C-alpha cells in the first residue's frame, strides 16, 4: 500500500476520482468497461448479474442462450444433427464416436 489507487481489471488502467466507476466484488470497471459479455451492454444504469465469475445482464441471464458446440464453437440448432455427452454437444461430425475407426 505505497499508493493505493483503485484501478480497472478490464483495461488494467488507473481510475480517476471524478470518473464514474463501478466497484463490485473488490473490483472496478470504467463507465465504458463495465458491460455484459454476451450483448456488451453497460449495466451502469441497468441491473446486472454475476455468475460463474462472469458478468451478464438480466436480458441474457434468461433462457435465451442457444446451445453452442465445443469442436467448432458454432451456434447449434435443434433440427441440426448434434451429439450430446456431458453438458456440451458436438456436431455429428465434430463428435468422433467409437462406433467405427
Ligand atoms: Zn477500464
Ligand atoms: Zn447481456
Ligand atoms: Zn461443431
Amino acid at each position: 500500500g505505497s499508493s493505493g489507487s483503485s484501478g480497472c481489471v478490464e483495461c488494467r488502467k488507473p481510475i480517476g476520482a471524478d470518473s464514474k466507476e463501478v466497484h463490485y466484488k473488490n473490483r472496478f470497471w470504467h463507465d465504458t468497461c463495465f458491460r455484459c459479455a454476451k450483448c456488451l451492454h453497460p449495466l451502469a444504469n441497468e441491473t446486472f448479474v454475476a455468475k460463474d465469475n462472469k458478468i451478464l445482464c438480466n436480458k441474457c441471464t434468461t433462457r435465451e442462450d442457444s446451445p453452442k458446440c465445443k469442436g467448432c464453437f458454432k451456434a447449434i440448432v435443434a433440427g441440426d444433427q448434434n451429439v450430446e455427452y456431458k453438458g456440451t454437444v458436438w456436431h455429428k461430425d465434430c463428435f468422433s464416436g467409437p462406433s467405427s475407426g
Side-chain angles (χ1 to χ4, degrees):
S2 51
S3 299
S5 298
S6 207
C8 191
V9 307
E10 209 298 85
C11 55
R12 269 290 184 170
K13 286 268 275 288
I15 302 167
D18 167 282
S19 85
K20 289 81 175 80
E21 62 60 62
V22 186
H23 166 239
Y24 199 68
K25 306 285 95 193
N26 310 49
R27 301 208 180 82
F28 312 86
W29 293 269
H30 279 120
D31 46 56
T32 181
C33 287
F34 190 60
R35 71 170 153 188
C36 198
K38 209 158 280 277
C39 60
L40 287 286
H41 186 109
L43 296 324
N45 300 329
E46 160 150 284
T47 49
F48 67 83
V49 185
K51 266 80 155 292
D52 278 271
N53 275 239
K54 292 188 163 274
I55 306 295
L56 293 168
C57 71
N58 37 21
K59 269 180 86 190
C60 284
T61 62
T62 194
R63 207 276 195 83
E64 64 90 55
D65 321 332
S66 269
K68 302 196 283 291
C69 195
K70 209 299 204 285
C72 59
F73 273 117
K74 292 175 189 292
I76 298 175
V77 180
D80 280 48
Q81 302 291 1
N82 331 289
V83 186
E84 184 189 64
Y85 172 53
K86 271 167 65 70
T88 323
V89 332
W90 316 63
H91 285 134
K92 200 74 186 72
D93 275 296
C94 297
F95 202 88
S96 62
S99 43
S100 296

